[PDB]
Amino acid sequence: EARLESIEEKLSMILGLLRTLRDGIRDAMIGIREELIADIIKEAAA
Amino acid sequence: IEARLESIEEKLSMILGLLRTLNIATAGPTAARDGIRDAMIGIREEL
Amino acid sequence: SIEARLESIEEKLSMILGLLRTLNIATAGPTAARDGIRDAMIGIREELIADIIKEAKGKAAEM
Amino acid sequence: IEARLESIEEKLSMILGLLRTLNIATAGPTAARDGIRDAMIGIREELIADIIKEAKGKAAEMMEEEMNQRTKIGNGSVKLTEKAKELNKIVEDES
Amino acid sequence: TVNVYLPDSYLKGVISFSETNAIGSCLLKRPYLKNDNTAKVAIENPVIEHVRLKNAVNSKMKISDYKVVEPVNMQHEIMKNVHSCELTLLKQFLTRSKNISTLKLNMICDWLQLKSILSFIDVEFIPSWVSNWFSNWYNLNKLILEFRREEVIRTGSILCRSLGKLVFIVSSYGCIVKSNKSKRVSFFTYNQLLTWKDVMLSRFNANFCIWVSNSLNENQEGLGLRSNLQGMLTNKLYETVDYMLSLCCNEGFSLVKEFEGFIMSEILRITEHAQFSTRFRNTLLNGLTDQLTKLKNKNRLRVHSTVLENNDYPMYEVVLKLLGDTLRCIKLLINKNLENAAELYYIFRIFGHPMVDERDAMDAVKLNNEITKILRLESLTELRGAFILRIIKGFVDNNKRWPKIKNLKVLSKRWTMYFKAKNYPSQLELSEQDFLELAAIQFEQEFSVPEKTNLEMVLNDKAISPPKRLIWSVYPKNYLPETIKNRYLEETFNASDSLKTRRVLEYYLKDNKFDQKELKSYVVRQEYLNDKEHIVSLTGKERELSVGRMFAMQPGKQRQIQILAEKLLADNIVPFFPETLTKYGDLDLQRIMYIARASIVTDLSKFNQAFRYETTAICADVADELHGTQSLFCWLHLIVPMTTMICAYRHAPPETKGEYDIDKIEEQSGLYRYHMGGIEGWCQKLWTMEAISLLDVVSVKTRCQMTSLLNGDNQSIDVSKPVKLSEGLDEVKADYRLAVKMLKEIRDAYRNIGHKLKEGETYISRDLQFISKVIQSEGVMHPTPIKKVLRVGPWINTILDDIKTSAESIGSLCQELEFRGESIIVSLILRNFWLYNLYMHESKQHPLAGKQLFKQLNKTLTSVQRFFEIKRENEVVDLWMNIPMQFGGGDPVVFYRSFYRRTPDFLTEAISHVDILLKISANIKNETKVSFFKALLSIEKNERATLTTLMRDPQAVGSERQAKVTSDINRTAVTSILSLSPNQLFSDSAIHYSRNEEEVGIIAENITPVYPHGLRVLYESLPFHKAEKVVNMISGTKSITNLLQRTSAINGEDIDRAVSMMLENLGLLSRILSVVVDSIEIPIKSNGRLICCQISRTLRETSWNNMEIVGVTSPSITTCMDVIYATSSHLKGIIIEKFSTDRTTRGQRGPKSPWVGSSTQEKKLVPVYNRQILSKQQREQLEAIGKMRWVYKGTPGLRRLLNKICLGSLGISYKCVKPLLPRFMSVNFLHRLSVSSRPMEFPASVPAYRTTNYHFDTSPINQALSERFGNEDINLVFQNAISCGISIMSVVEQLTGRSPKQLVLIPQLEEIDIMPPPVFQGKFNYKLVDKITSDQHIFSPDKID
Ligand SMILES: COc1cc(C(=O)NNC(=O)c2cc(C(C)(C)N)cc(-c3ccc(F)cc3)n2)ccc1OC1CC1
């Protein structure tokens, strides 16, 4: 009943941003850098 | 019963992630269209 | 059908995930490439990652 | 509990409808032949109206014939035009 | 010191609209054919060549006394002009060809046991619809050859000659024709002078072939070709179309284009039910009449403000009547006969070629490559899902696993369990939602980009564009302003020698700072996205019969990227798509051949210009993910829209306002910038894959079974579906309904992606009938015999006019009348006609050699006479022209080639041919015919036995008994040129080449016995091999000593070398007959005949100092086998029997499957490991090392040599690659070894359908062989014996009207020997390889980490 609460909350956000079809650049930057370091770790010894 | 719920939550998380980038190319203004270029040119030297 | 009422949810939201993937690929084109934002839209692909490591280690070795 | 499942089902169904009916207009010249206009997304009719109001001259025509009009064929059987019947009468006769 | 400009003899090029306009505008001082910028520049600042042409013309009669017309208004008068008659010459040629042909016919009938047919060709009554074309061609060709001879002496020459009532003034840069009868003048190019000649030649060849076939078939049916064409009606067709094209100036070729469609409609009427045929015919007629209506305005718009504006155009009615008459002529030639319709496919050439406008096709495609396209997201994602599903299936089938998936959380439970189980659903599953939810998957890197640049990939003999700033170098200086010229001279001083070349070879060999690791960094860093110096040029070179087809061209840097992307797709991803890769050779020709069945044949010719980034990226992204790159498979739509389209042809300039930068010049008829579509051929594989994957979605949406074949530019979709609806309209209406419904579905599917299929390019049918452009109906194939023999004549397919290559080409082209057509006599007659013309009439005058050649020929002709004591000089040429070329005679077809296609041991075949030729020749004494072989065996074998010759050519002979070739004589010159180049890598490789060549032969010198095919394998296992390819690619360039100079002319050294080779190969027969040793024993047989296999083996052994070769000698089926005719009664031979009872067998099919002679080689125990990461070159290395390990076992030094090779090539030890190597389990590699130089198929010399109606029994011959030999292997090839038997069945029916019911081939056991597996003794010289691998490392593969 807890994961569903987050689920119902996020559907409203998803529809809100989908109806438009400032801050997203920073989100994209942090997102790419999130997996860039992990991929580098895997690529870099065994 | 429980794997399905967490899988649904993860898939919605990726849905939100995708929906964030979709409004930089066409839905986003051309003025801020060049903002990410500085960071991208900086990634080669940020690591 | 309690366990079947949320597996259809999963399939449907995976379908919209595929739709959004295709939409994201489509909109990052010649306009995005010239402004140097296409790679942030698609991401890094294990090949530019090796390139940066080699120069980073090469410079570190040159020390 | 159960009701929220139905609510999320409705939300997903309508999101699927919206994403199924969505259309894309490709990137191209800005109608001033100076720069490239980026791709657009929206409903088919509004995109067509905007693009046609943008188009000038012969280009517009082919667009009208390439996205609005289409080949209307039923049970095949293409009819030969009146001018093409004269070729037929000169070719298939006196042989 | 001496540079020559030998012109062309055949078209081999393109007719230019702008060059003609420039010539005419310079001569008239008014626009000609058009009022574009070309006319302006030509009027104001004409080029020096056109000024000289103008002066030459003015010195002669004045131009204002005649009506100026286009060169195409003159064909009717040019094709009807009569000069001196040439009937006696034609009679002489025909008589001599008949003599040579009767000698060969005696040869065949002697051993086929047969017992005046050439008398059916009556030379005194030639129709005169064959003679006129011969006379026209003779006169025009004489003029052209005289001009070529004159031009070789002086750089720029103008020659004037009178041909009847026409006067020609010919030059290398322009031509004029004036007609006194009509009082009119025309201006054209050197092309349009030797295309009219080609039209005359083709008309003569076609009419001659049909006349000969009709003469043969009127006395014995089945002796000639299986098609009955009237020749008078073909002459009428030629004249009518000539007149129609003359009236309709140059827009009439778009009207000639529809003859193929008309023939297709006739075939469909013959073979199908009215519903399909009427639809096709009506669709054709509507478009044809639309074009007919639109013709007049096009011409009247083009010729505005021109000298031709005052000429009158034909009205609608006259052109309509002309079309009616020509279509009547075509329809009457097809007398409801499907063989005539397939026969008439040769008329697409017989009328001439159109004059292509460089700046008009570009304009026509501009607006197609510019419009915005509205796309549906759902279909766009379904296509991506189908592509991903194809990839998944390919990996699951080949590797038994899924590709690596970045995130295993975008999958539902169904696809999650499918992932865990490592399989995929069946076609009955996979609804649309499956594609939608599959399109969410992202792959990880499964492949790789090679770090080193593949020198065999980039290096080619092609052209490249200049950079953006150095683009004014493609136009004459006179055509440009002064400021442009000054700034261009300033700019060309700052450029390097590599950024000044328009050729790839000079682009690389002249590079001073080349690096093999540069391309990897270039691709990974995406240093092509924002390139100011990027440009796409469109030189406008095209192909046949089209008003526009632009050949695109690029600078070298991005050319590398295009080549690399195409190669990576071909190597890694084109597999998984059997529909496309298997198109040519297996899929369509033989493999593919109530439940309703139908076919759709949509075209994909103009497929690239409707593609956009949004339609290509959805799959190029999957390719990038698999290969790990960022943007390498979608470069085109990322870079092309940012640059300028130029159309940089030599003459047509742009109208610049005096500014250097092309990106600043306003868009014109030849310039535009925002090109949103695709370029033709640059990303063809990806677009093909998308087209294939769209049909998967279409098939899933409906529930039909679709199979797709991609034969060229056509897509053939064969559709099946259980109709489950009957009791009304039974069978034909069901097929029609299925076809219509699926046509609607396919057109809708293509529309949703952005392609608007035209009504005139897609059609429906009941069964596929034009796959790869071959007409096959009901299992019988109807050939187009006279389509490859239209241009047979003197000096064909020769860079420099050398008789050897020209004779080989004549023979090769005429052998098709035997392979495809079912007539051997027609092919013999044509071949000997043209060979006699070449040798005895055209060798007296050579542009570069003079009379020398003929003198040489006349000496060889004397010697043979003196050797054979021939009384009459006329019958010594007959004998000489039936001797193989390998011994120094003129005969570019060996005997066996008429019965089976492939063989080992060419030498034994040549020996057998000469033996039978001397056997039938009841003109020489018996002593001399046995003395010829003693002369052949008299050798001076004491010479250097280098084993690299056998590595290059396992079937090579030594001691100068062989004929020399171009590669072996140009090798030293090419290496010497490469040694002096700025590129350090190439210079070092060329410096070490000689030593590496001398050392590669020493590795296995002390190994016995010598197995030349094992030596070939060892050769392939070394990097030297690859270098030896590059040299051979540069040897064939027509100018070796001018590679590093910008001359585009043939140097004197090259001419001297070529002439020396040509003159030295013409005396080989004289050389071998000079010395005879009388102490040589010929192995005569107990039949009174000589054993050809033993003589061949002795000759091969002696020429190599008696070094006991093994595995190369094998008997010829023509001499080790005796053919007789019975009914299940004879002594232990192979029996060939006929299924049916009918007399003849042409045009029928039988119950049996087609006979293809396969080898069933190398029973192989392949390993089980991942091979996806390895490039193709590394896989070939592993295969070569495996073959080396298999062939040589227990030989001392083998393991050390293998370790050296593995370390040199792959960089890792031999014991670390042992698991990766394949394991062969077989004892006889003399039989099972598969390697180049060793044929892997043994087909018969008849079409496939003809082999389906015979069957063979080999039990008695097996019993006889087991009685004589043991159970071990022998020399005789079995596939080849069966092939020869089938071809005998066919040829006997050809020569005699009755096909034998059964024939038996008895083996003669004195010609057959055994090949037990050999045991090798001696130690390998394994050290040398090290050095080689060090100095040829630029051609090595990438080292395995
Ligand atoms: C593919 O390259 C080759 C293949 C062969 C080949 O196939 N050798 N043949 C037999 O070993 C064989 C054995 C037997 C036995 C087992 C005794 N019954 C019978 C027959 C046989 C033949 C014709 C017939 F009409 C009937 C039976 N042949 C030979 C040489 C080849 O290339 C190298 C010379 C360069």
Author numbering:
A (entry chain E): 173 to 193, 204 to 226, 230 to 231
B (entry chain D): 172 to 218
C (entry chain C): 171 to 233
D (entry chain B): 172 to 266
E (entry chain A): 8 to 122, 129 to 606, 626 to 1377
Sentences from the paper on this structure:
The polymerase is a multifunctional enzyme that is responsible for transcribing the viral negative sense RNA genome to generate polyadenylated mRNAs with a 5′ methylguanosine cap and replicating it to generate new viral genomes. The L protein contains three enzymatic domains: an RNA-dependent RNA polymerase (RdRp), a polyribonucleotidyltransferase (PRNTase), which is involved in cap addition, and a methyltransferase (MTase) that methylates the cap. Here we report a conserved allosteric inhibitory site identified on the L polymerase proteins of RSV and HMPV that can be targeted by a dual-specificity, non-nucleoside inhibitor, termed MRK-1. Functional analyses indicate that MRK-1 inhibits conformational changes necessary for the polymerase to engage in RNA synthesis initiation and to transition into an elongation mode.
